[PDB]
Write a protein that binds this DNA or RNA. Structure first.
Ligand SMILES: [Mg+2]
Ligand SMILES: [Mg+2]
Ligand SMILES: [Mg+2]
Ligand SMILES: [Mg+2]
Ligand SMILES: [Mg+2]
Ligand SMILES: [Mg+2]
Ligand SMILES: [Mg+2]
Ligand SMILES: [Mg+2]
Ligand SMILES: [Mg+2]
Ligand SMILES: [Mg+2]
Ligand SMILES: [Zn+2]
Lengths: 184, 59, 141, 85, 85, 71
RNA sequence: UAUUAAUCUAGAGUGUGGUAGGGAGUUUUGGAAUUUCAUGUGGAGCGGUGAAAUGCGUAGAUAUAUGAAGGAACACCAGUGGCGAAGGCGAAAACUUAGGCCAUUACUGACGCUUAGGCUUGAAAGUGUGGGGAGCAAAUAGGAUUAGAUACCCUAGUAGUCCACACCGUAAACGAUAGAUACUAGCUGUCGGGGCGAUCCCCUCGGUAGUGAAGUUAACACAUUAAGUAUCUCGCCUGG
RNA sequence: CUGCCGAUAAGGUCUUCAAAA
């Protein structure tokens, strides 16, 4: 799998914290792939936890077997320098198969390009953008669909026997009953 | 539910605070009397239907 | 002839056709399709001889592995059918076998009774003429 | 999860025969083996019990079928898989 | 006998001499209504108005109060029948 | 008066994925002034996304990134 | 039709490729809120009701601010919604795991439907052993009301509600509608997969709703998710 | 804007009819 830890180390001193993250990394993770690490920075988190108001957020983008979690998880709490820890397995988040699917990635790029074009015209440099068309409906249908529309599998069948056919065609329904008025 | 007075006028603060208190009073009164889980679900669906039907004709 | 829809049929072969005919009559539909079987093919041949349906064409696939019969009903000019009511006798489970002396007459001969004695499906009058009886498929009037 | 690819390749009578009865029973036995472990560990998951019972019953009916038709292959299949007992 | 200008939302059984036509356009209606009146006037031996006539004499105007809009809207005036309890 | 501009952004953008350290400032708009996940009428997202953002936002509120009851 | 000897894939399954889920169990984690206790400020009521009275309070209550401990349930999201065969499932994460939808130039080649007996699951209450107990509250005590009140109201309050392992197997366990299969106008929503590519909207294949004709019904009403036209199988009914 | 608020002996008529004007 591909996991993603977001570690919360205390707010002491930068250089010494990085060592704490490195120590916490090299101890656990029995079997592991490449361990890329980041550093989101220093933020004043919303609710105070462990009576601390500043914390260093680290992100790990390793990958490996399911056993890489147990030892690291049980040591995090014990370590007084770590406030929280979340192992978000990106193979189970709300949408992962589509993200690996190649066609959807290219379509998303195209949507980014086109959507950026619309927002630009609206927030025109200074000239008035009369259409202000964003939330409103679009124009006529997309001619792309009209053509590239799928064709159902019309299974072709060959006639073998017949009988009585004459295709009379009696498509004259709801015909007039009354015909010509008359007097007794 | 902090709302600043802006020190420009007083009424306006109470004009916004009335709304905030009404939605606040709804949940405060909900967790006052014990209903069964089925009845609690029943009351949630009842509120949603009332709000929905009213919004249909206001839209 | 080409199609677009998948064709399914019931496992019981007499009432499958019977349901198709009855539903089309009630809903005023004319052209229906179903899977083709030799018992089903033979009963449709005698029906068109008796003048209850207009045309009956059996077709096969391009591979010769499947056949589906697509029949149409015989509506008059004012759009009221020739079939009035259908009822199946030898249903699955309880198979009806009647000798010649007890061959039924449906609506005093107005309707037709389908009897497959020994030479395929056969009308009641000709069954009486040969003085031989057997399996009774369905009542059509 | 079980490595479905390896077990199917072992049970193939010939290539591309990925939908016979023999490949089905080899896969079913593997799922049964895995599910008995899981259910014995937990003992309170009853939907897994539902899956285990359904898979056992499905395997039994198919083997009955393979006895009714081509009984000789039934003897061959039973000695390799050791599923009877 | 009853004749009518059905407009796609009518039961064809009730009418006898159905005349497929519009019913929402103040121009189509008048053209067709005068046409039936025109038959009556010729039978009564008074001169026709629109029937058996060339282009210049059939010309009619669109009443007041791009193209004309024969769209049916005002759907918001159809809520759910008052219910709930 | 009101507006009809309520349309799921991630659909027009085809974002297809929500991660709490890729669009954090985007998720703060969905939250209420009193740190609450605004409903459909305010947030504007399709229910499917409305579910995805809620799980991610509650995850951030577990990760101690956004408050609970105050500003 | 039944038996036997064989062929075929359309029924049903398997694999590959897309894919949506509060589906389940096990182990950890989190914040509000209530209660109790600890420490400050404070000074006469608080509490409760139709109205009051038991009750709590100068031993400093209610209130306010901080902290600690502990148990239970998971606001908003949350729905003219999703999943499961049903009961049911809604804080976050990990592991294990069940079924389902769509497209299949692939494969087996009738292996399918139902199911007496049997097995599995099965809301809440209840039982047995050992833990746990913040809140609430059968039984119980008191104050009210009342002609009387063993009840509705109020103040206390044990079992219980919680966990682990063993049982009990009943509910308006309801869609008061057994399962499977084929056919029969239409319109409006909404959800998922697929096709196009800003959304929005169009088409296809399915799930979940509303309206509605033929058709059915004693009527109410059902109406493509049937209570309609038919077949198979099981269960059940025969006046109070 | 939610005080309080209980009971009521037995058996019984009444549609004769449309043949019709
Ligand atoms: Mg047959
Ligand atoms: Mg505290
Ligand atoms: Mg219980
Ligand atoms: Mg007492
Ligand atoms: Mg109390
Ligand atoms: Mg007890
Ligand atoms: Mg019962
Ligand atoms: Mg209805
Ligand atoms: Mg009796
Ligand atoms: Mg009184
Ligand atoms: Zn969306």
């Amino acid at each position: 799998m591909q996991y993603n830890i977001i570690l919360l180390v205390d707010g002491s001193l930068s250089l010494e914290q990085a060592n704490q993250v490195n120590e916490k990394q090299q101890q656990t993770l029995t079997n592991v792939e490449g361990l890329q690490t980041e550093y989101l920075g220093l933020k004043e988190l919303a609710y105070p936890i462990k009576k601390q108001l500043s914390a260093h957020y680290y992100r790990w983008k390793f990958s490996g077997d399911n056993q890489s979690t147990k030892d690291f998880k049980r040591t995090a709490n014990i370590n007084k320098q770590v406030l929280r820890e979340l192992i978000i397995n990106l193979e189970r988040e709300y949408g992962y198969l589509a993200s690996i699917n190649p066609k959807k990635q290219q379509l998303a790029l195209q949507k980014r390009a086109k959507y950026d074009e619309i927002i630009a015209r609206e927030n025109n440099p200074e000239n008035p953008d009369v259409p202000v068309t964003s939330g409103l409906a679009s124009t006529q249908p997309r001619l792309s669909r009209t053509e590239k529309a799928q064709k159902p599998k019309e299974e072709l069948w060959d006639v073998v026997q017949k009988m009585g056919n004459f295709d009379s065609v009696q498509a004259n329904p709801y015909r007039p009953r009354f015909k010509r008025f008359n007097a007794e | 539910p902090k709302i600043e007075v802006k020190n420009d006028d007083l009424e306006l603060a109470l004009k916004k605070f009335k709304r905030v208190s009404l939605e606040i009073r709804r949940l405060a009164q909900r967790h006052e009397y014990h209903l069964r889980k089925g009845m609690r679900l029943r009351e949630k669906r009842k509120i949603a239907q009332k709000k929905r039907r009213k919004f249909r004709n206001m839209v | 002839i080409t199609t677009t829809k998948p064709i399914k049929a019931h496992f019981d072969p007499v009432a499958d056709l019977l349901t198709k005919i009855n539903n089309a009559r009630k809903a005023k539909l004319m052209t229906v399709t179903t899977i083709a079987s030799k018992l089903k093919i033979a009963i449709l041949e005698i029906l068109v001889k008796e003048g209850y349906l207009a045309n009956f064409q059996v077709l096969e696939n391009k591979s010769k592995t499947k056949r589906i019969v697509t029949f149409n009903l015989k509506y008059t000019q004012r759009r009221i059918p020739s079939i009035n009511g259908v009822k199946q006798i030898s249903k699955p489970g309880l198979r009806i076998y009647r000798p010649f002396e007890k061959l039924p007459l449906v609506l005093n001969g107005l309707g037709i009774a389908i009897i497959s004695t020994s030479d395929g499906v056969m009308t009641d009058k000709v069954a009486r003429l040969k003085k031989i009886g057997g399996e009774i498929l369905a009542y059509v009037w | 999860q079980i490595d479905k690819n390896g077990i199917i390749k072992s049970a193939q009578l010939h290539d591309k025969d990925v939908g016979s009865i023999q490949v089905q029973v080899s896969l079913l036995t593997s799922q049964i083996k895995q599910l008995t472990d899981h259910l014995l560990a937990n003992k309170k998951d009853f939907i897994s019990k539902r899956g285990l019972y359904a898979k056992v019953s499905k395997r039994k009916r198919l083997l009955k079928y393979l006895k009714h038709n081509d009984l000789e292959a039934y003897r061959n299949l039973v000695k390799t898989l050791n599923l009877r007992g | 006998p009853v004749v009518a200008l059905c407009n796609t939302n009518t039961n064809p059984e009730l009418v006898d001499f159905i005349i497929p036509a519009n019913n929402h356009q103040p121009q189509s209606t008048c053209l067709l209504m005068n046409l039936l009146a025109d038959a009556v006037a010729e039978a009564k031996a008074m001169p026709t108005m629109f029937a058996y006539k060339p282009d210049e004499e059939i010309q009619i105007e669109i009443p007041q109060k791009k193209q004309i809009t024969s769209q049916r809207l005002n759907i918001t005036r159809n809520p759910e029948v008052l219910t709930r309890e | 008066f009101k507006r009809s501009k309520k349309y799921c952004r991630f659909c027009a953008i085809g974002q297809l994925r929500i991660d709490l350290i890729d669009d954090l400032e985007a998720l703060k708009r969905f939250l209420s002034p009193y740190a609450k996940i605004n409903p459909r009428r305010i947030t504007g997202n399709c229910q499917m996304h409305q579910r995805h953002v809620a799980k991610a936002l509650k995850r951030a509120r577990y990760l101690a990134l956004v408050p609970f009851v105050k500003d």
